[PDB]
Amino acid sequence: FDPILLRPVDDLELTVRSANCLKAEAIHYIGDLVQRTEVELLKTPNLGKKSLTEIKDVLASRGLSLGMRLENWPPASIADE
């Protein structure tokens, strides 16, 4: 599995309006991020175009795709509590 992917958009280390705004859209995990749709996500009253280039840079910098449903998400790398 991809580690950055398992990471939370907030801590994904992306921009401030991209990752941050991502966790505000019920997508605190970059996994769900790629498992969504930048079409409507990049049209909210708190998004932007310069952000679509980043979110896409993550969905394309890790062999991912738009709405690319991940395997059995989330992975087993989050079972400590």
Side-chain angles (χ1 to χ4, degrees):
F1 245 37
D2 181 51
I4 151 282
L5 195 47
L6 330 194
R7 250 208 193 72
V9 304
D10 213 16
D11 210 90
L12 152 67
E13 228 213 46
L14 230 186
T15 338
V16 172
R17 190 199 284 162
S18 19
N20 211 79
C21 190
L22 272 173
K23 84 83 118 125
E25 228 248 325
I27 301 169
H28 63 157
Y29 267 124
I30 34 243
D32 214 60
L33 153 56
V34 320
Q35 227 236 46
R36 209 102 157 187
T37 40
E38 293 155 3
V39 160
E40 298 169 82
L41 182 53
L42 275 292
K43 293 169 181 229
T44 223
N46 245 293
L47 221 315
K49 289 114 131 294
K50 262 280 194 230
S51 314
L52 181 42
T53 323
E54 250 61 60
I55 290 170
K56 166 188 252 262
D57 257 272
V58 228
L59 270 74
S61 283
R62 285 118 242 296
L64 307 194
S65 6
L66 284 301
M68 178 203 66
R69 239 232 182 198
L70 265 126
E71 205 83 9
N72 263 255
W73 180 278
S77 79
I78 301 124
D80 293 290
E81 194 54 42

